[PDB]
Structure formats: structure tokens, C-alpha cells
Amino acid sequence: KVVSTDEYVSRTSIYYYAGSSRLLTVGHPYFSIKNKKVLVPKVSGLQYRVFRIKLPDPNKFGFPDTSFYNPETQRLVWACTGLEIGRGQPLGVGISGHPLLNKFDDTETSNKYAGKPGIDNRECLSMDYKQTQLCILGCKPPIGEHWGKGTPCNPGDCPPLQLINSVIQDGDMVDTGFGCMDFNTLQASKSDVPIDICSSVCKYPDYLQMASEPYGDSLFFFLRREQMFVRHFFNRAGTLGDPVPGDLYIQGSNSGNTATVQSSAFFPTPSGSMVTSESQLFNKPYWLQRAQGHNNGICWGNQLFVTVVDTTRSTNMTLCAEVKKESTYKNENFKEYLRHGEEFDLQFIFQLCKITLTADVMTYIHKMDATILEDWQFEDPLKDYMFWEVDLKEKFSADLDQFPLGRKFLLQA
Amino acid sequence: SKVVSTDEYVSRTSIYYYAGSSRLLTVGHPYFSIKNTSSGNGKKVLVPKVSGLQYRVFRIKLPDPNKFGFPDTSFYNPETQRLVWACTGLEIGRGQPLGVGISGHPLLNKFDDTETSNKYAGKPGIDNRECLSMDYKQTQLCILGCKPPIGEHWGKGTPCNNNSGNPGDCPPLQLINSVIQDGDMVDTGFGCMDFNTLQASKSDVPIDICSSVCKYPDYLQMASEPYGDSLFFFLRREQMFVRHFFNRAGTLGDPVPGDLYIQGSNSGNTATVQSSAFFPTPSGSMVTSESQLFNKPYWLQRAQGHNNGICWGNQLFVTVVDTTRSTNMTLCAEVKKESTYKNENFKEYLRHGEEFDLQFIFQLCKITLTADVMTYIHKMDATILEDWQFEDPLKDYMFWEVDLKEKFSADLDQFPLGRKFLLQAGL
Amino acid sequence: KVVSTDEYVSRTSIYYYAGSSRLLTVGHPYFSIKNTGKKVLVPKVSGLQYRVFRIKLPDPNKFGFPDTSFYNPETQRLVWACTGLEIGRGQPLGVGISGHPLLNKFDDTETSNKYAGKPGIDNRECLSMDYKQTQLCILGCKPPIGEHWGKGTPCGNPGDCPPLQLINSVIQDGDMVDTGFGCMDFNTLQASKSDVPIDICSSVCKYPDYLQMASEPYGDSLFFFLRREQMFVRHFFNRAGTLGDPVPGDLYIQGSNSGNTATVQSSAFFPTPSGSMVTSESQLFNKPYWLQRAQGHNNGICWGNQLFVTVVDTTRSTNMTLCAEVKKESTYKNENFKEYLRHGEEFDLQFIFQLCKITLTADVMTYIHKMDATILEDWQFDPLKDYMFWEVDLKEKFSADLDQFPLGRKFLLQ
Amino acid sequence: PVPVSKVVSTDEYVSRTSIYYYAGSSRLLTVGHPYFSIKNTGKKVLVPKVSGLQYRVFRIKLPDPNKFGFPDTSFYNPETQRLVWACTGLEIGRGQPLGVGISGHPLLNKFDDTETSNKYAGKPGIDNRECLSMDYKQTQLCILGCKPPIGEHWGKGTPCNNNSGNPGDCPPLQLINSVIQDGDMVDTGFGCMDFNTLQASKSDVPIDICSSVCKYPDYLQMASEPYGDSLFFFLRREQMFVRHFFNRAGTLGDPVPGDLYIQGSNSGNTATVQSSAFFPTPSGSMVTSESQLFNKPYWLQRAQGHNNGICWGNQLFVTVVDTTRSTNMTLCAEVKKESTYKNENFKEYLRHGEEFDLQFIFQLCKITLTADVMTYIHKMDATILEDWQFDPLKDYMFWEVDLKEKFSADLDQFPLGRKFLLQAGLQAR
């Protein structure tokens, strides 16, 4: 029914290079600063970077010789054969926190009876998140999963849970150790997780669903490296919604310090441990020899999506400005800010391909994505989504050895 | 009267089929089930117990190939032969991110911290239980077979004969073999034992196992079974270390003998020995991508036993333990909306989700039913011949039933694990 | 001149399998418990013990072979050779802990220890620890030999430092492995009984004298060995008691009374060990080991129809907490419960043996008589009874049908 | 055929025979105190200082092969040739279990813990020294040569044409080379320096090095020596991390300049800066079997330098550092037996033991003494020719191993000899 592109896409020996040059974004690691207009965007090492790469239409490309294909019966398309995801900045680890995190007691070694909550025991705590590197390559944007609030099927009842699929947009937050969930709707107090995710949605890639799509336009390939361990053991203030059933313990004696049980609403903090050079997924070329799905790297619609998560460069810079210059130090004379910067350099190598548009081939392409034939001459549904637009229309070059990944292609292949 | 490889009487065809379960989901409470305590019956389960520390035991049901609508049935003779599926490939898919969950007890029997400083004063009192938590021993495993897997655990034994029997004597210990069901608890760092009967206070281990049985797979026994129906193969990866050093309140049942220490001087803080009922807390350390046993295909080339991947009775069992995704989600609902924060305005809940996708590749097999072969199969399992036309003892057990009757396909390259098959075998 | 057994022992193509079936022992991890007077009700069973199995093989010269035409009983004798071995281990991976309710720890000397305070009369504390992690297995036809430090000859005041002497001995089943405090006779070299935890504080901790076993001429003790040890220093303490060797004055500028420092604190430091993580990938057991070429001249020949398997495996040292109810009441009271500790070790020994023949010429009979005269005497052509071994009888357990058993299917592939 | 103006590999003038010999030391044992020697209280030693943090420098003495009782002397011509041993294999045997010892100082100059909380203020006072201990940087190494190894360490330099230096000024530093002797201390995490001269208070490092020199091998220098007699080969495995963050008491000699901070207020806790004389404690982390350099044979195929394993002067030097078996044993003796425990009734001691077994395989070589060779060897070391008939190292301390009466041709009678006959593809004579 669905076939590999190898049966209807003819490969040429024409290769082209394209590079984005330096890409930079600088912002605040925890929240955007709105003063709804954005003066400082939210820029964090815990964000998905989803690049929408724009390719020149090869059927309208200023080819110097157009005698290799026949516009009467054939059309051109680019296929991706190589990719290098460049990363600037040193390796480093950032930290996130909440000035009013709902931590009550430390339950690791010493938590004797007793001490009941009271009105507000929130504390000012921070942590380092779960370490994640990942890259996804495809010609349609990737699909993630997260837990959201279900249908009502009472005030303070546990919300029903539902697994949600969505397109991963640029700026979405990756999971951090507290799971892939919509914190804005499932944590009402805004105090159970750090402020950079407490009103955000944390998404994890739906690798299983993307792998099982028939055409395979979302996942040509992927790399991932996750790690975390549990750094501290806490519990929550607030009323325990699901009290421990009586058959799981012998109750304490009345008129005894143990006769009202403490909350078993435990929660861990995560930690990503070390970041290392030898673990890097980036700054090294990856050659697509054979995709996992039926789309063997064909960039339908003359576009390509590169999804990147890299927490190994998440260092948040401390900036300090002087309010009044005086001969002795006073805290009131200085203001403290946080800024984060991410640096990328996307390099690609593309292969020119031609498609003979017989009767059977045009039917198959129409069933796959009718917009492919309509664009070939033989509004955009993604405009509601947020992507980092990379325009490579005028960036194609045929002289590969002028550029880093092209010199590597002329050797490594 | 000799057990032989299934290769001696089962012929392989070149017919291969793919089957996939699609996404499998369960959501629940990581420590205990919630069962309509007020306003109804005890049995009525509103929220099941779902924890990354549980066994997932899938009973996969295959369509009967002798009744399957094959497009060409000229490869075998129903007059003299019967068909059976063989497992050649398997991918255990896992959704959800890697993560680590935490378990605890609001009244855990921890007395003193015995790691660095534990000076003499020493007598516990009536109730010194604390609200403590911990992260468990990390375990990954997968076992594949056509009969359910067998575990081991320690249970209360029977007392020596003509031997009493005073209350509070140390319980007799007995190693018990049993079938591992879906929802059984894996060992967590405190061993494989029946905590319900061997720990009477209900307070010596966290609440998600303190009334459970924690089982460990009896790999040795499954391997030494003559036919090898429980163990086609297995992968396992365990790790833990000791994070903290505690001791117990309560009377020390076996006092330290006097030849092992010089007693302290009376009228001195050392005149009554502290409890040497020590216990550690475990810790599973990091979870990493490179350690994963899952999300990658495994091909049965040669099973360890005599059953070389033959799925007798058109069923197969896939056993999984995966604590590398045990993150417990914190849910918080608002009781009253107010302009300032008050603890009494919010309720805290815990929920855990497990995501699976099981993919298989099966090879069609035919069996010529000669006189010796029917005799052999009858000794092995007479119910095999009865089903072929030539109640179920597993109905008391709990399995995650996966019905693949309507899920078999001959178009292998339409599916992920099938495209991968077409590269490996070179077909 | 000692020669390899390859020069006078002929190999046949006859192989046999033998398995012990499941082996279980349960006990108290720290000490044995006696009756009601002299009796072991609960043995001392600990993940820190050597397990030394004495495997008894059927005499092949008296064995009921289905075919006895491969050798000449007038001029030849039979003996077994070990070619394969799988040391099965049940029970989950885990770490147990040991301690002492009256451990001689004084101060924590890691980070903060200011000069305030004269030691006193009795400062022992109730502390525990995780031991150094050790896996090993040694295979031979004579029991293995260990090393440990013991009390020497005095050559003499009472509190003087005991003289040290390195002592060799046979490693018996139930002996304690080194734990991080060294291989020494703690019963004699630590008089207070409080400097190390109670499960070794009156025991002898032995380490295998690998150097001596390898350099013995016949090589009957060590066909091969595997070992994997690891530990780090978890805490830094010092001792109470009078410091026997005071620090010489040329190593410091003495303190003043205004600093409270004019009496030095005890520099009898001691670390606690820690074995760190136990992992699946580090395991020595539950996988076959094939003897192709032994290290010594005895290439796996089981003289006397016996084989010794020495094992240490601390990676399954979990100590179970058992809790019994004295009185059932509706509320919790500590006095209603008694707390116990139990440990269980599960083994399953599988072997594959190769039948061998020896032509008993005059030279060979001369050589074998020089090596061990009891070999010829038993062929018709026990000083180890004072030692404690886990006896494993395989006389009635040999089978020629190799593929009926786990290690026999694995043998038929490799 | 060997030029006098240039140094050449020994392969150009040393002929190898097919004669191989085994020699083993058997068990080597030393027991002592891990921190200091215990004397007789003029200067006689009752218990030596024995520590896993010491260099073991073995001087192995071989039989002169020109005077050795060979059964058949027809493989060379004593009229025109002389014999010398070449080392082809080595196994450094190590007994005792793996373990880690700890060192300390009852009066260590630690003031505050500067890792997490060190608030203002805190008055130094006259004496704040504490009783602290630590585990040292983990080090394994082995070096083989026919001359003793050369170490490096920092010492007090000479102050020339300038006597205007004040008492308590920072001493001038100078990198010093020396022969590493048996019993010298390896660096522990505080660097390779002469602590006796560069740390005057005697309290800034633990007592087992505070009046010692910690030396590190000058690998770069030994490798660049023309003849290469000190370095046939070497193996090394070092590791450490920072366990604690402390600072020193005493006056800070180099105060932090004012352009590096905004000063505090005079009537405020901050107007006298605390000492930024920081110092870490080290930690060697785990010791593991999989990391061992020893108890495995090492075969010399081709040395890095020009001396390709020739044992000139019929001697060999084996240098070993192994902190992976550094467990210090706790010994406790009873002063008075009483029915109850009293601290005063017991004495606490420390003892450390090191166990070795050195095994070698030597290859016999012959040297045809033509005119060019005699000139070449005379320029290299005239004592070689003089001993052949054709001392200065006794001021240094080495663990002397006499193997004169220990050579054997029956290679397969011995552990390393069996290992040699397999790696060489030989079958026992």
C-alpha cells in the first residue's frame, strides 16, 4: 500500500551544501519579560528548539543546465543526505527554582513527630534538572506527548488524566524530572514545581507514535541521551487527597505524638549529574543512509524540521549592575539579573532527486499529501505553530569544499 | 522418555507475520488502590495501584493458525499436519520519559541514624516512627515464553514439630515458588519476601510493599525445567547501593551474645545495649538511555531450552520490570480560590502512568502428526492435541490480556518492527 | 622435575554433566544462635562468608559405564578432569549492612573536630556500615589457602603492641572474607572486641594467598580464579583508648593552654569502608566458565575424585528484617514487637567433566607416588576431616545425556 | 659500526641469544607504622615507617653472567665477547587485600569550612588547629630501568645577592631533581614539594608527609635522556577529586588587592576580610580490581629509549607505587582485664603491611668487543668495561633483592616461566 520512496524517487549525483551560519538567542531562563509584548523572551536550556528550514524549490531553482530532467513528465525534490548540528558556548548546567516552593519536611533521614502545616510553609528552593540531549529530523514537525486534564465525567477532587498528542513548537519545555504534564492545569497552587515550568506544559517526544506513522515524514532518525537521579526526598504541604488506607499500618495511639499521620505526598528532586564532552550528540556529522520509515529523507514541500534538546549548555549567566557607586558594599546598591544564551549552527548536505510523474505515481503522491502535487503545478496549516524559521533559499552552493560539512562529505560520505 | 528440541518435530515455513498491540496505557496510584471506601462496596476499584515497581505480565493471544484465513493453504496438509506460531522477533516499546519515583511510609519504624553519631541514651519509648521516603533499587528485566514466568520469595514457614511457639518468636522462613502475575511487586532493596506475614507491624518497609509480596524471578528453576516453556530468553539489569544506615525500634529478638563485646559499666550510659537491628535504605542511582533494555528489537535465534520459540496454545507471555520510568506525577487541585495562599485550600494527589507498545514477528510452522510425535506431544501437554481436534488452569491468575486475533498482517514492511525484520534476515 | 598433566594424562571424548540442584542455607548474618545448651538453631549465614564446596565425584574406575572398552584396566586407570563450570546464584542483588552497638568510634574527624573535650570512661556508639564488595571463585582439587595477620611470638609489658606474623591456613566454609579492615585475627589483635563490627570482631578474616597457590609446584589448589573487589572510604573516625604510639615531637609545634590544645587528640584514625553499587554487568556468576588451560601443571585433573569450589559473593548480601507481634492491640507500641535479622544464600553448581585415562608405566607410577602416594593406593594397583566444608555429593548425579541440562546445552554450542 | 659521536640503540651492538632464565624473589614482606618510625628514644629504629603512600624502589642484583656456571659455554667466545642480561618480562606480585588507608594530623591547620556556610564573623585566636584525617590521591605506577629513577619536587630556592629578605616572607621556589629512593613519599594531593622546608608550621598537611618530601617522577626528563637507562618503560594510573574546602589560620601573606572586591563598612562584620588561603582535601575514590597494574605479566618488546632492556652492571631497578592496598590495621592491646569496659584499659596502635613477589625472565646477550664498541661503551659508562676485565649509589636507600643464587633455566617450574613459554610460543626444554 505505502511504499519506500526508493521505488518512485530517482536519485541524481548532484549534491548541494547549505549552512545557516551563526544562530543566537538570548533571554531570561525562567520567564519572558512582558512590558502583551515581549522585551526579553524566555530562553532556557530546558526548551525544545524546533527549526523550520526553508529550501529553494528545485523546480524553480536557477539551475544552469535544465537538460537532466523533463518538466513535461518529471518534477524535482530535495533529499537530505547529511546534517551537522553545531553548538557553541561551553558545557555547563543551569538551575531552576521557586521562591515559594511547596516543600514541607525533608523525609530522607529525620522527620519526627510532629509539626503540622499551618498556613504557609513554602520555602525558597532550587535544583538542577534531568539532563536530556535529543535531535529529531523530518520533513513534518515532530509530535510529543504529555498528561492533561480530562473530561469531568468535588472542589479539590483529583483531576482525571488523559494522554495528549500535540506538535512540539519552538520554546516548548522538555520534561525535567517531574514528568511530561500540563502543570498549568494539573497543579493549581503554582508552587509544586519551579517557576520555569509551573505554568508551562512539559512535553516528551511520542517516539512510538511517530515511528508507526505509515509514511514516516516526522521521523527520519533520532538520537537521544537522558539521565537523572533522585537528589532529595521531600513531602508536600496541603491536605492529602488520598489518605493512606488503614490496612497498611497500625495507627498511632491517641494522646500520642503519632495519632495524626503526616502527609505521604512525597516528591523527589531530580539531578542530571555530570555533563561531559564524550556524551555529546552534536558538533559531529550525521549521514542519513537509510531512514527508519518509508520516507527515505525526501524533503516534501521543500522544507525540513530539525528538533533539538540540549541541556548540556544550560549555564545561566549572573549579571550584576550598580545602582549607586559607593566606597563600601551595600546590598541595596546592586541589582541581580539572569540571562541565558543558546548558539547553533545548522549545516546540511542535500541530494537532487527527480520524480517521473506516471499515472500510478501521481495517484500515490495525491493520497500521501495532495499539497505536493498542487505546489508542483502539474493558507499554510502550520502557521498557527511556533518555529525558529531558517531561510536557506539563497544559501545553496554547489562547491562543497568551501564549507566545513562539505569537506567532510568529500571524505567521509 | 527424553525431551528433545522442538526442531526435531516442528518444520519452519518461510511465512512470516507481524502483530502489534498499539499503545497500552494504565494510570493509577503508585502506593495503593483506591476502592470507593465510603459510598459503596470494597471491591469497586476507582483507581488501581499502578507503580513502576510492579511486574507487567502480558498474556498475548494469537489467532489459531489452523483456523486462520490464509490466502494459500497449499503449504501444509490438514490431513496429516497442524500449524503453530513461532516467535522470531520482539520489540518492547516504552513511552513516557525516563525518571525515578519515590516511595515511603508516614510511620516507618526508623529509630536512630547509625551512620556517624549514635551516642548512648537509647531507650525508644512507645512510638518513635517517622515519616520517611526513599528511592528503590533499579531493575530492568524482560522474560519471554509461552507459559507464565515463575518467581521466588521468602514466606512464613511452618514451625518445627513438637516445638513451641511463644508469641513473638522469630518466624520460620520458607522459599516459595509461584507464578508471577501482573501487578506483583519486584524486589526493592529489602529482598524478595512476603511482607504481609513476615513483618507484622506493617511499618518496617514503605506502604507500597508492606502488605505485598515482593518476588524475584527463579531464573535457575525456569532454566532447568525440561521443556523450557517459561524461558525462551531473558534480559535483566539490576543495580543498587546503600544510602542510609538505620536501626529499628521494638525489642531486639536475638540479643548480641556476650562473647562478642565487653559490656558497659552500670551507673554509666552504656549499661543497656542499643538495638543492633540495623537496616539500610536502598538507592537505584542514575537512570540512563544507554542502559535501556527496551525500545530496541530482540531476535530469537536459539532459545535456551528445548522449546525454540514455539507458542503452544497460541499464546505467549511477556514479562517486564522497568523502574527507569517510575516518575510519580504530583497533582494538586484547588478547594477555594483566594487572593492569598493557604495550605488548607489545596489537596495533593499522586498518579503514575505506564505506556507500552508490544511488537512481534511470528513464523508459521507445521507439525507432521506421526505416531511417535503425537505420543511425545501427549506426554508434554495433552491439551495441545485436544485443541487441534486430531477449564483453563491460568484463569485464576491476573494478566494484562493482549488480544491479537484481529491484529496479524503479512505485509511486514508496513510496520516498524517488520521493516527492521526485512533488513536483519535479508529477506 | 614437575611436569604438566598433559604429558601423562590422556583425554577421551566422553563428557558428563553434574548438577547439585538447589542449595539453600538461612541464618543470622552476625552470629550463631544457641538453644533453649550447646546447639546451633540458626547458623551464622552471611554474604561476607567464604562458601567452600567440597564436591565428591564418582570413582570412574568403579563407575557403571555403558561402554568400558575405551581403556585397559590392567595397565590404565581413570580420573575426571573439569572442563566446565557454572556457579548459579539465586536471590536478588542487594547489599547488607553490619554494625556494632558498642563500636569504638570517638570523633568524626572529617570536617570539624575542635579541641574541646577529654575522652572519658566509655564513649562507644551504635554504628553500622556497608562492607567492601568482593566477588571471587577459586577452583582446584585441593582446598584453597588463605592469608591473614595473627599474633606472633613475644620475643614484654601488658599494653604493648602485639607482634605481627603473616599466617597461612586452609580456607574453610563459613570463614569470613576481608571487609575493609584487613585480613587479621580480630579475636587476638583487637582486645576490646569493639574496634570492628560484631560479625568479624571475634573472627579471623582471610584473604586468598594467590601468590603462594600459584607458586606451589603441582598447582592442585588453583586451576583458575576470578576476582572483583572494590571499596571506598565513607567516613573518617578516630579511636578512644590510650594512643599506644604517641606522635613524635619532630612532627609538630606543640599547643598552648590558651588554645586548649596542649594535649593532642588521638591520631588513631580509622576509616569506614563502602562497597558502592552492585550491578548486573559486574557479575561473575550465572554464566559458564570453561577451563581450557589451567595456570599450573595440574590442568584440571580431579585427583581423589573430588573438586573444591570456593566462592565469595557479597552482591546478594541483603539481610531481611523480620518482625513478629507479641501482643495484638489496636494501637502501636514498640513493646509489642520483636525485631530479627535473617539472611539466605542460594546456589546451584553445574559442572561438565571429561573422562581421562592414565597409562601406569614404571616412570608414571614413580612420578605419581612422589606427588601423592594415596592416589595409587586408592586405585588398588584423610587429613581434611578436621576442616569444615559444604559437602556436595555428585556420586549419583552424573549424566551422559548432556542436552537435558542447562550447562550441557551451553556446552554443546561452545 | 657504532659511531662514538652519536648514541644508538643497543640493538646495534648487543647480540641476543635464545638463552632465557627465570628469577624470582619469593615473598617480600615489610610491616611498620603508616605515619612515622618508632625509634629507641640516640637514633635506633625499632619499628620502621611502612605506608602505601611510599615509593618502593627495588635494586635487583643479578649474577654476573661472565662468571656464571653455564653447563655449555659454546654459544659465545670468551676471547672476543662479553655477556650481559637483558630483561624480557616482569610480573610484580602483590599480596594483601585491596583497601584504602587514611592519614591525618591531630593539629591540622584548618580554620573554617569554606564550602557552604562561612558567615562573618569569626575571631582567629591563638590556636584553632583541629584533629582531622583524609584519604589521599590514588596512585599506581611501575618503572623499570638499569639505573634508579629520577623524581621532581619543589624545594626552597637560593636567595642570591639579596639578604634584605624579611622573616616570614614567601620562600623562593625551585624545581629539584633527585634519585627516588625506597621509602620516599609519593605526592598525595598537596603537590610534590619539600614540606619540611616550605611549610614551617608543620601543621598544614598530615603528619605522614609534613616533614617529608613528596616526589613525582620526572617522566619527561627520564624519557629525553640519551642512553635511556632509567626508563625502559612505565605504567601509571592516578586519580583524585576534591572532598572538602577549607582555609588556613595564620596571617595571609599575599592579601587580596583592593581592585578585586568592594570593601565592607568599618562598623560592619566585613571590614576585616577572612583568609582566602584556601586548601582542599583530596580523595582517591574507589579502588577496583579492574584497574590493577600489578599481578599481571608485562613483556618488554621494545623500550622507548636506546637501552632496550640491557641490565648494564648486572643490576635492575623496579620502582612501584601502589596506594590500592593501603589499609592500615587497627591493633588493640589490653592493659587491665576487667569485667566492664573502660577506655583507659586499652591501647590503640596502627600497623601497615606490604606484600610483594617480584618475578623476572632474563635473556642472555653477547657483545663482540671490537674497537668501535669498546670506545662506545667507554664513553657511555667506563665501569662496564672495567668490570668485564677486558658503587656511588650506596648513599641511597633501596630495597635490595639478591637474585645471584636464584636464576634457573627450568622455565616451566615457575609461575612467570609458564606464562613466558606460552607468550613466546616455546615448549619446555
Author numbering:
A (entry chain A): 20 to 54, 61 to 178, 184 to 408, 442 to 476
B (entry chain C): 19 to 408, 442 to 478
C (entry chain D): 20 to 55, 60 to 178, 183 to 408, 443 to 475
D (entry chain E): 15 to 55, 60 to 408, 443 to 481
Give verbatim excerpts from the published study on this entry.
The native T = 7 HPV virion can be mimicked by an empty icosahedral shell, called a virus-like particle (VLP) which consists of 72 L1-only pentamers. High-level neutralizing antibodies elicited by L1 VLPs can block HPV infection; however, protection against HPV infection is type-restricted, and there tends to be little cross-reactivity among HPV types.
To ascertain whether structural divergence drives HPV type specificity, we scrutinized the crystal structures of L1 pentamers of genetically close or distant HPV types. First, L1 proteins of HPV33 and HPV52 were cloned and expressed in E.coli, purified, digested by trypsin, and crystalized. The crystal structures of HPV33 and HPV52 pentamers were determined to resolutions of 2.9Å and 2.75Å, respectively, with refinement to Rwork/Rfree values of 21.0/24.0% and 18.7/23.5%, respectively. It should be noted that the surface loops in the non-crystallographic symmetry (NCS)-related monomers within the asymmetric unit of HPV33, HPV52, and HPV58 might differ slightly in conformation due to their intrinsic flexibilities. Then, five L1 pentamer structures representing two groups (group 1: HPV58, -33 and -52; group 6: HPV18 and -59) were aligned to compare the structural differences among their five surface loops. Collectively, the structural information suggests high conservation of the overall structures of L1 within a phylogenetic group of HPV, which even extends across different groups, despite minor variations in the outer antigenic surface loops. To explore the feasibility of including more genetically close genotypes into a single, chimeric L1 VLP type, HPV52—which is closest to both HPV33 and HPV58 —was engineered into the lead HPV33/58 chimeric VLPs, H33-58HI and H58-33BC, by individually swapping each of the remaining four loops with those from HPV52. Further pairwise comparisons of the surface contours of wild types and mutants illustrated that the most distinct bumpy protrusions between parental and targeting types were located on the side-chains of K53H33, N57H33, K59H33 and K60H33 for HPV58 vs. HPV33 (bottom left), and K380H52, S383H52 and E388H52 for HPV58 vs. HPV52 (bottom left).
